Structure 1
Amino acid sequence: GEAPNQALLRILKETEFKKIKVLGSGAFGTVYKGLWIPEGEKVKIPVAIKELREATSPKANKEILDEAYVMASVDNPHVCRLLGICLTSTVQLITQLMPFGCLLDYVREHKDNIGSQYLLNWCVQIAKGMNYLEDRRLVHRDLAARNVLVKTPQHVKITDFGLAKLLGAEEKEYHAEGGKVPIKWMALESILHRIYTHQSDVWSYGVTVWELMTFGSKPYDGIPASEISSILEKGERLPQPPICTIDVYMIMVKCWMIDADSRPKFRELIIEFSKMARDPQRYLVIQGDERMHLMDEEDMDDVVDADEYLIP
């Protein structure tokens, strides 16, 4: 009693796309930047191409195809979608280019120009994407700022489905196996029982929210992954970001309750952050909150311009 997944997997000819520059060569393969030019039409589509290292890997090959399967099965404005695959020596995933890269690095190199309206709209958008995934019965499993891409400063989307698992109809949770999950973003029950749920994703959503409000800080900067379970067992949690009103911080804290059902639901996070988005400054206190444009390059507020200083 399960719905057939009639998603279309598109096989694209390598001749149809012109690679142009590598965006990153991490410990997973490489991500390129290019243009997809379908033979028939008269359109040039900016795309990102992801593949593995030159030599063929056994299990890594299955993993790209697993990731292709999930990306080809989601269609939402706040989720990254697969345009298709190109069967070369190694399989290549092709998706829409998110020009401004990942959100984490984005908040880092733009701290001095990120106003409360942008922060709150991203929380709404990320919550919408996640609620969609929940409707599709998909449990992310690696939600974090690094996995949210920026199409434009006003439009972000969730990505990286490398660990995503689709749950059955009467299936409530996923039981994992190997240890390859980032500890500092996982629910307590995940670390203790390898259990994952939509509610487990909410915990990660909370942490993701923390990264944004702190403009890109590393959660538990000191503490090493091994200790995280214990500090969490003692009831410790991430600190209140300086720009955070208690209203916002209470949202992050709720996503971190021990009882998973006590945490909010993505559909509720959307409503909550949406209300706050209508009146940004009542919820986040940021020094500039616009732009913060005559570079003094000094620490002085008794400065007065010469054409305002008259005959003494």
Structure 2
Amino acid sequence: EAPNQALLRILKETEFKKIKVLGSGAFGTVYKGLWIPEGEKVKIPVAIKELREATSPKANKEILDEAYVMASVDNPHVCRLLGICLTSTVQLITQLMPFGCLLDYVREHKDNIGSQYLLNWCVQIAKGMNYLEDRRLVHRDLAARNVLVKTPQHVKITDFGRAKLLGAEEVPIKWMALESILHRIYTHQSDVWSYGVTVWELMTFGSKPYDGIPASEISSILEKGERLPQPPICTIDVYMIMVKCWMIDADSRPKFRELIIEFSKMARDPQRYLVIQGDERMHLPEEDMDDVVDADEYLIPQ
């Protein structure tokens, strides 16, 4: 086990301003923001994640764990933490994704969403997931909701709160593998299953898995050998890949690097693998912004 030498960056509240609430839920809320690095003359669009006035340590322990992980990852399809604020309750500052989470995005723009885009997102998500495997990280919460859109072409994974190192002792049932549901066993292969469902959400355009079904039931349903239905737009090949992710034997399940390859192939001839109406037709997209720089463009030594 190599040492983790990731730098953790501490940011003064003066450095950035919250502009809007992108989302609020539970303990904490997320704000669109602008961050200006000290003496740098760059403005970086950011999302700031903060919990409540309530500052309970247990909450803080959880947030910081999440920050730790985000600080430690560097991939194009993985979200990275820029810095943290220690003002009163802690805040996580990370690059902003203008178009939001993917799950919302498919639902909003389904009429204008191409097959090519869908296959690419699969490729990119598998790329992100493979990188986590490389770092021996298990996301343990893969879902469409946890995927964010920098641009229609570019997407990255997020929400590393449940993330853990492989083989470490240390709840979305529908996403969870069966082995995990019965025994709380998590592995990269468990992650792959969750990926399968994530793929299904996109194909199904944001439809909720196992809709109308109580979670307690789900374990039995999976036990029976029941699985999610093949989506209308899905070719047999694409669905078949999905089903492989839902195999009882985790080893039987496809590796993330294999998933990248297979979906890659399909993206070369997207129309053959997904059938969508008017696929060809579809196309997809404060005063001073001169200094604006994207987080990807903004780099620091090390």
**What is the TM-score when the length of structure 1 is the normalising length?**
0.89
Q: Segments of 4+ in structure 1 off by > 6 A?
A: 297-312
Tell me, yes or no, if the aligned pair for 2:44 and 2:294 is still in contact at 8 Å.
Answer: no
Relative to 1, partners in 2 of residues 1:221 and 1:13: Cα closer, same or farther, differing over 3 Å?
same
**Equivalents in 2 of 1:88, 1:72: separation in Å?**
19
Report deviation, 1:39: 2.1
Is structure 2 residue 298 aligned with structure 1 residue 309? yes
Could you list the per-position Cα deviations for residues 62-88 of structure 1 after superposition, in whole angstroms to 9, with x for gaps in the alignment?
Answer: 111000100000000000000000101
Which residue matches 1:119?
118
Task: Describe the superposition over 1:77-125 as per-residue Cα deviations: whole angstroms up to 9, x where unpaired.
Answer: 0000000001011000000000100000000000000000000000000
Task: Tell me if structure 2 keeps the 8 A contact 1:84–1:94.
Answer: yes
Query: What is the CA–CA distance in structure 1 between the aligned matches of 2:187 and 2:293, rounded to whole Å?
Result: 59
| Distance verdict in 2 for CA 1:15–1:198, change over 3 Å | same
Instruction: Report the CA distance between 1:54 and its aligned residue.
Output: 1.1
Within 1, Cα distance between the matches of 2:69 and 2:183?
25
> Cα offset for 1:290?
2.9
Shift of 1:192: 0.6
Assess if the C-alpha contact under 8 Å between 1:141 and 1:163 holds in 2.
yes
Q: Could you say which residue in structure 1 is the equivalent of 2:194?
A: 204
Question: Which SS does the other structure have where 2:296 is aligned?
Answer: helix
Check the 8 A contact 2:44/2:293 in 1, yes or no: no
Q: Deviations for 1:42-72, whole angstroms, at most 9, x for unmatched residues?
A: 1100000001011212201011100010000
SS in 1 for 2:155: strand
Question: How far, CA to CA, are the matches of 1:136 and 1:306 in structure 2?
Answer: 22
Give the distance between the partners of 2:202 and 2:237, measured in 1 at CA. Answer: 16
CA, structure 1 residues 224+300, in 2 after alignment: closer, same or farther (shift >3 Å)? Answer: farther
How far off is 1:20 after superposition?
0.5
Q: Which runs of 5+ in 1 are unaligned?
A: 172-180
**Pairwise CA distance, 1:18:** 1.4
Say which structure, 1 or 2, has more relative contact order (CA 8 Å, 6+ apart): 2
Give the direction of change, closer, same or farther, for the CA distance of 1:298–1:229 in structure 2 (3 Å limit): farther
- Contact kept, 8 Å, 2:50 with 2:91, in 1: the verdict is yes
Say if 1:307 and 1:29 are closer, same or farther in 2 by CA, change over 3 A.
closer
Q: Describe the shift of the 1:169–1:231 C-alpha distance in structure 2 as closer, same or farther (beyond 3 A).
A: closer
Report the Cα distance in structure 1 between the residues aligned to 2:61 and 2:300, rounded to whole angstroms: 80
Change in CA separation of 1:63 and 1:302 when aligned onto 2, cut-off 3 Å: closer
Identity of aligned residues (%): 100
The change in CA–CA distance for 1:53 and 1:309 in structure 2 (over 3 A counts) is closer
| Bigger Rg, which one | 1
Distance 1:285 1:301 in 2: 42
> Relative to 1, partners in 2 of residues 1:40 and 1:289: Cα closer, same or farther, differing over 3 Å?
same
Q: CA deviation at 1:41?
A: 1.1
Secondary structure at the counterpart of residue 216 of structure 2: coil
- Once the two structures are superposed, residues 220-276 of structure 1 have per-residue CA deviations (whole angstroms, 9 ceiling, x without a partner) of 011111100001000000000000000000000000000000000000000000000
Which consecutive unaligned segments of at least 5 residues does structure 2 have?
Answer: none
**Cα deviations by residue, 1:144-185 (Å, 9 ceiling, x for unpaired):** 0000000000000000011000126999xxxxxxxxx10000
CA distance in 2, matches of 1:306, 1:4: 26
- With 10-19 and 161-170 compared, the bigger mean Cα shift is at 161-170
The structure-2 alpha-carbon separation of the partners of 1:306 and 1:188, relative to structure 1 and needing over 3 Å to count, comes to closer
Paired position in structure 1 for 2:168? 169
With over 3 angstroms needed to count, the CA separation of the structure-2 counterparts of 1:89 and 1:239, relative to structure 1, is same
Deviations 1:192-239 (A, max 9, x none): 111000000000000000000000000001111110000100000000
Asked whether the 8 Å contact 2:42–2:292 carries over to 1, the reply is no
Q: 1:54 and 1:245, CA in 2 relative to 1: closer, same or farther beyond 3 A? A: same
Q: TM-score, normalised by structure 2?
A: 0.92
- Kindly tell me: are residues 222 and 298 of structure 1, through their superposed partners in 2, closer, same or farther at Cα, counting changes over 3 Å? farther
Distance in structure 1 (CA, Å) of the matches to 2:290 and 2:10: 62
CA 1:129–1:19 in 2, change beyond 3 Å: closer, same or farther? same
Asked whether the 8 Å contact 1:113–1:290 carries over to 2, the reply is no
CA gap 1:43/1:206 in 2 versus in 1, 3 angstroms: same
**Number of equivalent positions:** 300
Please provide the CA RMSD for this pair: 11.8
8 A Cα contact 1:112 1:291, kept in partner: no
Q: Which range moved further: 193-202 or 302-311?
A: 302-311
